[PDB]
Symmetry: D2
Subunit: 116 residues, 4 copies
Amino acid sequence: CPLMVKVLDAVRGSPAINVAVHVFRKAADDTWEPFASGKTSESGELHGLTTEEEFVEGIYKVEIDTKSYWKALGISPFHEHAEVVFTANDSGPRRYTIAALLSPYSYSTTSVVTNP
Amino acid sequence: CPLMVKVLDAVRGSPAINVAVHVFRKAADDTWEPFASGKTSESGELHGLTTEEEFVEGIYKVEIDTKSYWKALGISPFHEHAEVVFTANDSGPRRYTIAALLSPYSYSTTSVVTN
Amino acid sequence: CPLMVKVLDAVRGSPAINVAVHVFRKAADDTWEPFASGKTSESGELHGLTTEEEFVEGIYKVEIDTKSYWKALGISPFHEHAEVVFTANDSGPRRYTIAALLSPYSYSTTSVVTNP
Amino acid sequence: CPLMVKVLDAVRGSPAINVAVHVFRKAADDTWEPFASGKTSESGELHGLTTEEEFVEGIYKVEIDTKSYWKALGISPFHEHAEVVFTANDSGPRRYTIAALLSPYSYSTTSVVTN
């Protein structure tokens, strides 16, 4: 798949399991249209959100529901979510891995972009 | 004084200067209405965005325009911007510092809530 | 293998290839004895440093040669290396993934620890 | 004044207070000789470690004792400490700020070199 999301828990040193992820795409009228969604697995990875055909050029927003994750563990975190906004496929199809590392008052995100 | 934004450049080891910062507040219809904005200083810091009187409880979004920062430096970035969305709560007096550490394909954000 | 090291490049959004890694173990006399070494592959991962039998309890230091990495790309970075120092296997054997994300003036490291 | 250390807690969103910090300088025999040390303040900062006169070119190691910080809070940490090893260079006047953001199983360190 051309898009994978991986989430890690910096407090426990583990994948972040069952984290809800919503992906949006900017439409012609500059509104965020729903594009794909899912939940991270036991490995902290969410595969299969999209296909090469559906994943056209555009501006995408990956919304990782960090608050609900921490709340279920009893922590009141700072952020409502972690959002990753980027232009995709504007130089041809690529493969994207969006990684997020989560702490109650911090998060970091990095992207690994490869060419098939 | 209740809200401060600080941006750092991890490629150059320096403050990220002249980074545009836009703050929004979530309206009742769940839209993002403009609230405050500015540009980071020589020290990478942006002070005086809001006041105690105006910074009521609610959900705020801080948008750091990281793409134009890297483009001015001639470095290809991944992100359109960095986004920090949080709930301001009054539980005692509190000051919010949102720090962001920028790399072309990565950013980290952390918030220090004190006093 | 019970120990894997993964290195990512935050400037290019890619694995950090050919990064030298040296692992040390604190001996009885508190000196760092050489334990294992290797280079990250095309995926940024270094596998096979050790075995379950050799990877006893102890204090280990993972030295990632970040400076040489950036220098070969023409960048003069801040750090001489990134070092990850931790006690291992003190509650029984575990599996450890040491991840490092590199920028010229910054690095972050996180560990994923799992129980077989 | 040429060297400042700042430590932050990503679990609590706060300065990391009373964190022991040990600085070493690499001797000619490549051993680590003690150079300066202290504890972080209420603001998570440690100032006045060294002076311009004493902070000559050379390789320095800054050791942040993160394990005792988390143990005092009753949280199991991964690392023994966080280590920052760098070359001090005189190429113009420069000030070094080593910042560290701490989580139980993760830390990030960044250095701002200015002026």
